[model samples]
Target: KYRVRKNVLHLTDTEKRDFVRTVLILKEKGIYDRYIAWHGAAGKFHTPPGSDRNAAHMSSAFLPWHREYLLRFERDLQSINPEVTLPYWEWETDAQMQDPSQSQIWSADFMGGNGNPIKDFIVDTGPFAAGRWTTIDEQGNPSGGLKRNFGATKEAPTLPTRDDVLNALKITQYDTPPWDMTSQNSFRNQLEGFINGPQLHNRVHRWVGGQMGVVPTAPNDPVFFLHHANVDRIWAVWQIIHRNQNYQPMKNGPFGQNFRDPMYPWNTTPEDVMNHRKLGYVYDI
Candidate 1:
């Protein structure tokens, strides 16, 4: 089990940079070598030519692994700097939903873009985003799987051409009309629309891991964690922004009744993600 850690009151630009640098340095210095090694080569961004099954497991099992991994990273940092703590971006608190003008909680000065070079730039172009079903190999199994290019792998994949996805911005709603929130559509509908839609966008460099596509497979694929940290961060922000929305599915829909269980058979759980703050971890701040 894991517990949330205290939040940093507010880190100045210099402090934030220093903290991220410290963690990154630790990663490079092999401070996490054992943890990563024990975790099955956990650091490459792309799934290797033959890592489809393993990568699939990771995509779904992201929560628990990251909860612990981030905690370890935080604890290591705190050992030398007790005064330091993790920071969080409560994105959900924003009153305005999609407009850029709403992002005013953080400083425009202290930790600017240059300070946090880890932010992603590309975007998902979904539906059939990037997965390609190539001919099966000699083993009589599908050789290709969902592939994308955005992690630290040798070469990242790109979004599918226009012909591949429905629309980058909208999902294809069949008989039902589009569930536009402005019309006060049901939350369930909105969520379903989101998940059902092709959402490939903003993929500059997946930190944790990219989509289950072409990237090489190394659990150390930093993209695996970083990408997920941001994804989790987005959800965390959404919670704040939409305080009324329940994190758990109240009914059977995208999240089936028992769906919140560990992402994998023996891996990940709602319990693991129950307290991100206590674990002394936040997003790419």
Candidate 2:
């Protein structure tokens, strides 16, 4: 499910200002709630769609739904400032880490979630296991890249190469369930010294590996962004599979409740989901 878009850019100063201003205006109008819905169990720390939980698969309505909300924000900002573009903060290659000037991905100040604190999803600072990427040395013969490891290390675990991501994405919907709690468990067992704990209040990145597929160090990992973008894409795909058809509840179950029910609290109404056309949004997941 997790997949990043081709090259997201960030909002400029003017765009940022407009975004802040418009959001304030919308808040005054009571057009939205402080939160859209409540998270269950481990996700409770961070709200659904939190930044960290990058690998989590979702029901249909993810792509169009988020685009709707984000586009609404973008439009609101543009109303105030015509020149503004929604800044795409690209986490990979170029990111301002420890900037303190902007919102860091895992800052506690960020909105955690409603109700209780989120449990600690252990952060693994270990070696990459899908096998390492090969690099060319002086004569062009292949050599292993620098041994990369996860958090707390200067070295980054050799992440799945570009080919890895493309190959992973090619796998069909019936192929595999996106990584989830099992990821948390599996990675921990393989990599030693990786520990998880409960935060005073958990946020999305803390619970779900943030933008990168299973890494928790920073949000800039290219894979994280792509993974999430794909995750968002999966939700859109799922909706098409089951229209007005509520399956059993729970992640592994074959069903879910109607959009109107409190289980999916948001602006989503039964009529709002009369089909993707009525929704007016589409995705490539």
Candidate 3:
């Protein structure tokens, strides 16, 4: 049977405990080290041949590329505990609460709160915080903790609201070429927060700062999975709303890769991931 990915806020006490425990187990087993390695490799894979274009970020494939990455990680986690499924952070609810960084999800028992002032913004408490875990830095070197500066700086003092998501979902086209950040009327750019308003993905990274602010090693933080899981869920919701619509780059135009292109490190194409049912899971949002 297909598993369901629930909102992190909605998880039962046991569910939350299992989630935290399984994540720590993965960290103890050094699986997070492997993920950091893959993220490092993917950063270099961004620039496709014969052009300066990035294959993942700032492109149409960002959603599907991340979808593939998240799915691969979830599959590995399920191998350790079949009940394990990626949970979405539902930052909107936190926004409603008025202080995202202060949300219960960041409590020491959960993903933990912000970083300490003297510790290079390294998270000092929580399941994957300092003294409990270490991760690879942007240079592919090992470091003695996961880091976050949630709302600690001007770059990330706030979180996206329901309106931000609603605005992006209102966009009709999946994406367009040159399928990068500048594409207007493009949901990809909107969700990616490349355009002027209602920033989605990029804003979260900027707000979190620390490791998450750095692209090459962001996945080293376990929250990376949940963040992208929610992003992936947004795509699923968009697809459901526009049942007849599909991906873009209509026929591989002059610049970037298209929806049909194969995402690096994975055998599947974006076309293969359009339906969440086929992917064997659904979001509970």
Candidate 4:
């Protein structure tokens, strides 16, 4: 693999600076907003017109669709600086800390700290604070500042644990029949965090709160890339362990969820991103 995505905590000072500056450049050029809107639009585009399984989430294509999304985003990042790779925030590991909110990934130099209630929960410090980073709403219009209320949900009051991740990886089938949020013992559903009703990926989204707590507006925060990178990494790990298993719903699935079907908002199929290494990158983990 030509690019190595390291853990956010493992990134060097230069890497951190380079990544943030590149993101700002993309934001200035209006490319960053494209990512936010793409994910938002894909969410509501239910495959075959309604059953709740969209092109991206709550379905069999979740992992591969996101894999394609990150690869394309990374391509954009690489365009800005060839040396830069997407760094992931390992929130499961951060969950071990007494106060997970104090994670270094949230430092002023990086992702920044939590929101300030005095300012109506607006992020007031770091590079992405209100005035520094402009956000957008569902209409693809200027939505003001990035906001975060970490661990604000009772359902996901904390980040998921290492064991929680380990358990999901143990699921054998990539996905199951009637593929959707309700699929049982399905690795896709479990890792998607609907099995236990908001576990790993979903839990992390809820834990972050703010725009992240909502699906359509999640990518308004830059960390959405980082979070999904870890998710892609986890999916990579699942691929390594379940070497013989194939992407489920090879056929007879919703239009966008099949192995060869094109993911909405883009023609990239699940087949294109099935192999992480073939995509020309590997995880530092």
Candidate 5:
């Protein structure tokens, strides 16, 4: 791969500054809103006509669809500054801290701190603070400021642990039959945080709260990319660990979720992006 995405904590201050600057430029030019629209649209696009599974989440295509999503996002980032690469927020390790909020990823200069109660859970610090970074609703309307209420939910009071990730990694199947949220022993379901209910990916979304808490409005927060980068890395790791394992339901599943079926909102498929390194970027260990 010609590009390497680093850990959020591993990024130098200048890398952080450059990334923030580039994202702001994209926002100013209205380029960032398209991503928000795409994610929201994909969520509403139910697979198999009326099933709960969508092209982006709660299905077999969840991982690969996001792979394509982030690949496109990184392309946009590279357009602004070829030197910049997306970073991952290794929250599993951050969970080891007494105050995970103290992690460098939440530092003011980077993603900013928790929402200020006085501002109605509006983030008042960091480059992505209320005034600095605007948000959007599921319908693509201007929704004012970015908000984050970290660990506010009793359902997801903490980030998923390293052991949690390790156990998910141990599963050999990429996904299983039914392919929705309930597929047992499916690595996709497990990593998506639906196995035991909101454990990994889903927990990170809830733990971040505000725009990040809900599905359609999530990418409004910059950490959404970082968080997904971490999740993607976990999948990439699993791919390497289980050399023979591949995406489940190669055929005869939902129309939009088939192995080679074009993912909605984009023409890409799991067959196209099964290999992360082939996408021209690799995560920094």
Candidate 6:
């Protein structure tokens, strides 16, 4: 059965414990590493060595691809503990505070804070720090540590506000031609933070530098799930606000995977993923 995902900050102590324990279990079993590799393999298209670029990020398929990815990862965690659901990080709360590293989510008990200045961004504290937790690199090699920089590296003093979200919501079209990063008057561009407008989704990645800052390695950090969960929630909210519109890459249009195209390992399409109910999960935003 599907489950409802809650905000990380709102999860009860017991729920939080269960969530953390499940993540550790996945990490210990090497399942987490496999997901990291999945993303890393995709990133190779956008990363330095390969120049074709538009396979995942900065494209119309970004939202659908990530939605499918998160669902898969959630199922992986569920196999460890049926009660565990990936939680969303309402980053706006931390942005309002202006220093995300200080948020309770970064406490030693939870996701941990920034890396030591002298230690190459290797997270030194919290549950999934350098010593006990590690991730696979883009080359699929085992790295002995996870990394984070928080506010120290990137200059993102603050995150996108409610106003920014409102601006993105005001957009009507889902995506337009040349649907790879340059599309304007497009909600995909705005939410992807590509337009010269509010930095909503992309801002979060830059705000939490280190591995999360790099496309291929972002999922190495556990917070990547929470961050994308919130992004997915935003998409859900957009769907409700614009229910008449339906899924994008509408009717065999160009530059993105079609609504009926298979979204890789999930054996689902963008059209199929549009309704959360069909997927057997809902976001309790």
Ranking by lDDT: 5, 4, 3, 6, 1, 2
The 10-residue segment with the lowest total lDDT in model 5: 131-140
lDDT, candidate 5, 1-285, per-residue tens: 989999888889899999999999988999999999999999999997688999999999999999899999999999999999889999999999999999988888888999999999999999888777888888777888999999999999999999999999999799998999889999999999999888999999999999999988999999999999999999999999999998877999898899999999988988999998889999886
Where is the poorest 10-residue window by lDDT in model 2?
A: 186-195
lDDT of 4 at 67: 91
lDDT of 1 by residue, 1-285 (tens): 132332223446566555555545555565744444434433232133343323222232233444455555567767656544444433222222353222332223311111112323211222111131121222334434223332344332232222222232132221121212121233222321233322221222321133333233332323234333434554454445555444332224121112264332234544556556654455543
- Scored by lDDT, model 1 comes in at 0.34
lDDT of 4 at 262: 89
Q: Pick the lDDT winner.
A: 5
Give the CA lDDT, 0 to 100, for residue 111 in model 2. Answer: 15
List the candidate 2 regions with Cα displacement exceeding 4 Å. 1-12, 27-32, 36-88, 93-167, 174-204, 207-253, 257-263, 266-285
Q: What is the lDDT of candidate 6?
A: 0.77
Residue 202 shift from truth in candidate 6, angstroms: 1.3
lDDT scores in order: 0.34, 0.29, 0.78, 0.91, 0.92, 0.77
The residue ranges of model 4 lying beyond 4 angstroms of the native Cα positions read: none
What tens digits encode model 4's per-residue C-alpha lDDT throughout 100-119? 98999999999899999888
Candidate 2, 154-191: lDDT as tens digits: 23322222333233233333211232222232211111
Which portions of model 1 miss their true places by more than 4 Å?
Answer: 1-13, 35-60, 83-202, 206-227, 241-268, 278-285
Candidate number with the higher lDDT (4 or 6): 4
Residue 221 lDDT in model 2? 26
Q: Report the number of backbone clashes for model 5.
A: 0
Question: Which residue pairs overlap in candidate 3's backbone?
Answer: 106-112, 156-207
The global Cα lDDT (0 to 1) of model 4 is: 0.91
Prediction 4 TM-score vs. true: 0.99
